[PDB]
Design a protein around this ligand. Structure first.
Ligand code: XK3
Ligand code: CL
Ligand code: CL
Length: 247
């Protein structure tokens, strides 16, 4: 459609902005992309890429609504859902500061809702990292598209040379949610690789049940074939109706 149909309220991060649709005042978000300096090839990839985004409809995946071309300032806007809770990275960062651990109930919601997101991605065949996981205003958890640093979540196989690879990464993410730090830490990737191949890490804090520790521990198995599948994860007695998405 057209940018004039929306009013920017303010910038979230750098560009992403919270916006209001004029027709009904609905609160949304858009992402600004300046293609002015792109080749025709880069733009064709962009077109198809954006095309695959409109296809994905799922409660646990950030919903995209529209693409908007402003050829005058060579900007493409991708209009999406507003997730008022922000991203999971900030939640973990915050926890670290106030030295306050997250509730097991929140960890179970994230496990449940991200596992369902993964199942969808696999079916239709995204980076499983805290910075790419978003919270809305009704306790729902949503996977985003994006989709120098140390690769904390790289799996043993995807580090030598797989859907069980996603399970490892989810393990790393839930582990980091609980402990406020990743299972494996190191100053260089080589040292990191060293620690991963060993497959050893601390138990998540004792405030968390043995059942939660067990499942996260399984996801962190060195053998992908010992890691639980999406199906096996959701059969876990920990996971209850209220841990799923609600409108
Ligand atoms: C409180 C708003 C906030 C703070 C940190 S992130 C964030 C927010 C809120 N709603 C959103 N829809 C999003 C995005 C960012 C861009 C993203 C992507 O790269 O595709 C989708 C989710 N962030
Ligand atoms: Cl602490
Ligand atoms: Cl501990």
């Amino acid at each position: 459609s057209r940018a004039e149909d929306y009013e920017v309220l303010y910038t979230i991060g750098t560009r992403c902005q919270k916006i209001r649709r004029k027709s009904d005042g609905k609160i949304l978000v858009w992402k600004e992309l300046d293609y002015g300096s792109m080749t025709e090839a880069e733009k064709q990839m962009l077109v198809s890429e954006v095309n695959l985004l409109r296809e994905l409809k799922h409660p646990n995946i950030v919903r995209y609504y529209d693409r908007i071309i402003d050829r005058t300032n060579t900007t493409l806007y991708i209009v999406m859902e507003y997730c008022e809770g922000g991203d999971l990275a900030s939640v973990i960062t915050k926890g670290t500061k106030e030295r306050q651990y997250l509730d097991e109930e929140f960890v179970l919601r994230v496990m449940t809702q991200l596992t369902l997101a993964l199942k969808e991605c696999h079916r239709r065949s995204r980076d499983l990292k805290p910075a790419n996981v978003f919270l809305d205003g009704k306790q729902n958890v949503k996977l985003g598209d994006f989709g120098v640093g140390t690769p904390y979540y790289m799996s043993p196989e995807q580090m030598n040379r797989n859907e069980k690879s996603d399970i490892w990464s989810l393990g790393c993410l839930l582990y980091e949610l609980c402990a406020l730090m990743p299972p494996f830490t190191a100053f260089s990737q080589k040292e990191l690789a060293g620690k991963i191949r060993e497959g050893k890490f601390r138990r998540i804090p004792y405030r968390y049940s043995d059942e939660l520790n067990e499942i996260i521990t399984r996801m962190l198995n060195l053998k992908d074939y010992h890691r639980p599948s999406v199906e096996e994860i959701l059969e876990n007695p920990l996971i209850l109706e209220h841990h799923h998405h609600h409108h």
